[PDB]
Design a protein around this ligand. Structure first.
Ligand SMILES: NC(=O)c1cccnc1
Ligand SMILES: NC(=O)c1cccnc1
Lengths: 466, 466
C-alpha cells in the first residue's frame, strides 16, 4: 500500500526544522520555465490528486512505519511524528492543503504559473513542500502531452500542405511505447497523455487510467488494429515469409492490418512478395481495410522513401489536387522505428520533397514518445514564492548569479487573460487589483477533497490545435 | 487491480491467429544486443516475477474485463477468450510458462542471453510473447544499475588516483531522482537499481521495494542526511541568507548537513557567509558531522572548481599522501546539478587537473541517474529464437538487410563459461553437447511459481567492481 509519509525526498523529512520560526504559511507554485516548445499542455494533476493526495492519507500505522524506516535511514529520529499526528487527530488524516490549477488540457505559454500549493492550517507550514516531489512528477504527463501535440502540429502542417485537409490526423501517430517505458504506472500515465492528442494506441494501460480518473462519453479513448511482430513472421521459417504474409492478411481480410516486412529484406518483401507474389490479395482489399506495410530498421528517412518508390512502381499511384503522389486506398505505410519529434519532421519533409503525400504514411513511436523525455525539456520547476512569518507576508524567490533562467517568481500568483487574448502571470498579489479578468487558476484540491475535476473529453477540447 | 490480460501491447491480442497452425512451443529470449557499456548488470526481473506474473493472475472477472475493453478497442471480438479460460480452468489461473535467467547482479558482456521464456503447455504457445511487454520493461532496472555502476567505475578510478584508496565510494553518488522520474513505480524501481551500487539515496520509494522483493540483512538498504532546499533558504528573505544558514547548521550541529548555497550568489555564500561570517560554526564541527556546501546552478565543472578555490583560501587546506589538496574534514562539497555519466567524468578529471582530491566531493544525480535513459542505450531486445510446429523444432531468427546489428540468435540458447573464464552464448541447442560446462541460466519461474530468488545482499556482491 502507498504511504504519503514515505513518498517524498528524504531531505524534505528534515525541512520542518529549517524554515524560519513563526512561519504560518508556505506558498509554492509550478511552472514550465521560459528560456522549440513555446506552449505546454497542462495535464495529469487530477490523476495525482485522486490516487495519492485525497481522503484519509494518514493513519497511526503509516506514521509508525515512517518513523521506523526514517530512524534507520537517517540513523536519527528527525522524522516529524508530532506534525503528522496533528493531521491525523485534527483532520482525520486529510491534508490541510489548497491547490489551485489551470483547467486540464489548457495550452499555456512557457513561464506561467500552472498550479499553486499552500497550507490551510498554520501548524502545517511544512506540508506544502513535503508534497513537492509527488506533484512535480506532473512534469511527465505535461511533457508527453506537449511533445505529442507538437508532433501533431508537424503532421497537420505537412498533411494540409500535401493533401488539402486534415482527415485522419488523429491516427497519424500511434503509441508503440509500452515496452520502452520504465514501469507499468508510467505506461498508463504516458499513454493517457498521448491520447489527449491522438486516438491510436497499443499501450493498453492508458485506457484504464482514463476511465478511472477522467472519463469519456465513448466506451474507450483509444483504438488499435491487428498487426504482426517479428515472432509471427519468423516462426514460419526463413523460406516461408510469403506464407506468413498470406496467412496474416487472409486472417484479417476485412479490417486494417499492419504487417512488419523487414524480417530479412524489407525491399524484397515490398517489391517481390507484396508487389508480385501476393499483389492479388492486396488489390482486392477494402478502403476501410488496407494493408499497412511496416518497415522497422535502417535509416528511417531513407527506408520510408525507398519503400514508397518501390510500392509506387508496383501499384497504381495517383496524383492528388496538390500535385502529390498517392498510393491506392488499399495500401499504406507505417514507420514505427526510430521515430521522435526530430525524425518525424525529417521524414515528412523528405516525403514532401520527393512529392509523396502525407496521406500515405502513419507513424509509430515508442521510446521517443513516452520515455525519451526529461523534467529539463520544459524546465519544469516547483518553487516557494510566498511565506507568512510573524503575521507578515514576505515575497520570496531564488535568483542564482550564474543562471538568470533559474530566477523564480515573487509573492502570491495568478494567471490572467491579456487584452490581446494571451496569458500573463501576475506576481506579488497584484491579481487582487482586478485590473485583469478572473484568475484562471481554480481550486482543484482543498482539505483532502478534490473540488473540481475535468472529463477527458473536456481536456481534448482544450488541447485542440488552432 | 492489475490485470495481465490488459498489460500487453494491443497487437499481441491478435497474434494467436498469426502463428503457424499446429504450433506447440514458442521460445523467446532477452539480450542487450552488441555494439561503451561493454557489460550490463542484470537486475529487476525478480520484481516483475513476484509483482505481476506469479500466483493466480487469471480470474473470470479479469477475462470479462479484458473482453469488454478489447471489443471496443478493436471494434471486433479478436480477444482470445477461449485461450485465457483454458489457463483459468486447467491451471487455476497460473501461467504455464518457464523462465530461465542469469543470477541477478551478474555482470555480463553485451550480446549474451540474459533470460529465456517458453510455454509449458502446447495450448499456450501464444502466451510466451503475450508477456514480452511486461518482461522487456526489465530494460529499465538493468539500464539504471549498469549506468550507475559505470559511474562508480569512474569515481573509483579518480578517488584511487587522487587519494590512494576507496573509502566512502559507496556514498559518492547520491540519488536525487524522485521528482524527475515519470511515476511513483518508476521511482522505486530506479532507486533500487542505483542501490545495487551505492548506499546514498533521497528516493525513499526504493527502500520498500527492496524490503518487499529482495531483502537485506541491514534494516534499510539506503541512507541519507539532513539537507536544505531553496524554500528553506529563501523563506528567510533575500537579506537573511546568513540567518537561514546559521539556523540550519545549528539545528543539525552533530550530524552531516547539506546546505544549498546558490539561492542568490554561490560564490558570495562560500567566501563571505561560510568563509567569514559563519566560519566559527563550521571549524568547530566534527569529522562525523561535516558541512556539505551544495552548488546547484551554472556550469557544473566551472562552479565546482571556483567553489573549491574559494574554500581553499578561507579554510585550512592540507595535502594528502598523493599530493592532492584536501579540505578539512568538517567541510565537503556536493555537486547535484547537471550530473550525468558524461559531466561526472568531466568534473572529476577537471578536479584532478587542478590537484583537488575526489575526497572533497560527492555527487547528486536526478534525471541523469533515473530518467535520461532508454531501452536503446543497451539495445535491449526480446525475440523468438525457437518454435515447435507439427512436432518439429525449427531455429527462428530475424536478420534485417539494412541493420546487421538487429540480427537475433537462433534456436535453443544457453550461457556458459569459456575456458578463459568469460561468458559465451551457445545457439541452436549446442549447449546440450556439454563441450562447455552446464548452462549458467537458472529456472526462476515455472507454472505460476517463483522457483529461484536472490537477496539484495547477494545482488550487490555479484555486481561489485573488479
Ligand atoms: N502494433 C505495432 O506494430 C507495435 C506495437 C508496439 C511495439 N511495436 C510495434
Ligand atoms: N538532498 C538533496 O539535496 C536533494 C534531494 C532531491 C533533489 N534535490 C536535492
Amino acid at each position: 500500500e502507498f504511504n504519503i509519509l514515505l513518498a517524498t525526498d528524504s531531505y524534505k523529512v528534515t525541512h520542518y526544522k529549517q524554515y524560519p520560526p513563526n512561519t504560518s504559511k508556505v506558498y509554492s507554485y509550478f511552472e514550465c520555465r521560459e528560456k522549440k516548445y513555446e506552449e505546454t499542455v497542462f495535464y495529469g494533476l487530477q490523476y495525482i490528486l485522486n490516487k495519492y493526495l485525497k481522503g484519509k492519507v494518514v493513519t497511526k500505522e503509516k506514521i509508525q512505519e515512517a518513523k521506523d524506516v526514517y530512524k534507520e535511514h537517517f540513523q536519527d529520529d528527525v522524522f516529524n511524528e508530532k506534525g503528522w499526528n496533528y493531521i491525523l487527530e485534527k483532520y482525520d488524516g486529510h491534508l490541510p492543503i489548497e491547490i489551485k490549477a489551470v483547467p486540464e488540457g489548457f495550452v499555456i505559454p512557457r513561464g506561467n504559473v500552472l498550479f499553486t500549493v499552500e497550507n490551510t492550517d498554520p501548524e502545517c507550514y511544512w506540508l506544502t513542500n513535503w508534497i513537492e516531489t509527488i506533484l512535480v512528477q506532473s512534469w511527465y504527463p505535461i511533457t508527453v502531452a506537449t511533445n505529442s501535440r507538437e508532433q501533431k502540429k508537424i503532421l497537420a502542417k505537412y498533411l494540409l500542405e500535401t493533401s488539402g485537409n486534415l482527415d485522419g490526423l488523429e491516427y497519424k501517430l500511434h503509441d508503440f511505447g509500452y515496452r520502452g517505458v520504465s514501469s507499468q504506472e508510467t505506461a498508463g500515465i504516458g499513454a493517457s497523455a498521448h491520447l489527449v492528442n491522438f486516438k491510436g494506441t497499443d499501450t493498453v494501460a492508458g485506457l484504464a487510467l482514463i476511465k478511472k480518473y477522467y472519463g469519456t462519453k465513448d466506451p474507450v479513448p483509444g483504438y488499435s488494429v491487428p498487426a504482426a511482430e517479428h515472432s509471427t513472421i519468423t516462426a514460419w521459417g526463413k523460406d516461408h515469409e510469403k506464407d506468413a504474409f498470406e496467412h496474416i492478411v487472409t486472417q484479417f481480410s476485412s479490417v486494417p492490418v499492419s504487417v512488419v516486412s523487414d524480417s530479412y529484406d524489407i525491399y524484397n518483401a515490398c517489391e517481390k512478395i507484396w508487389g508480385e507474389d501476393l499483389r492479388h490479395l492486396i488489390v482486392s482489399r477494402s478502403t476501410q481495410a488496407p494493408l499497412i506495410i511496416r518497415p522497422d530498421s535502417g535509416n528511417p528517412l531513407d527506408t520510408v522513401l525507398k519503400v514508397l518508390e518501390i510500392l509506387g512502381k508496383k501499384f497504381p499511384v495517383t496524383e492528388n489536387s496538390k500535385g502529390y503522389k498517392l498510393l491506392p486506398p488499399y495500401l499504406r505505410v507505417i514507420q514505427g522505428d526510430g521515430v521522435d519529434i526530430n525524425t518525424l519532421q525529417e521524414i515528412v519533409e523528405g516525403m514532401k520533397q520527393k512529392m509523396w503525400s502525407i496521406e500515405n504514411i502513419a507513424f509509430g513511436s515508442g521510446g521517443g514518445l513516452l520515455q525519451k523525455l526529461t523534467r529539463d525539456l520544459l524546465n519544469c520547476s516547483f518553487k516557494c514564492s510566498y511565506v507568512v512569518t510573524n503575521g507578515l507576508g514576505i515575497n520570496v524567490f531564488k535568483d542564482p548569479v550564474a543562471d538568470p533562467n533559474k530566477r523564480s517568481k515573487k509573492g502570491r500568483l495568478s494567471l490572467h487573460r491579456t487584452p490581446a487574448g494571451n496569458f500573463v502571470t501576475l506576481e506579488e498579489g497584484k491579481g487582487d487589483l482586478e485590473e485583469y479578468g478572473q484568475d484562471l487558476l481554480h481550486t482543484v484540491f482543498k482539505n483532502g477533497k478534490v473540488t473540481k475535476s475535468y472529463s477527458f473529453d473536456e481536456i481534448r477540447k482544450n488541447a485542440q490545435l488552432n
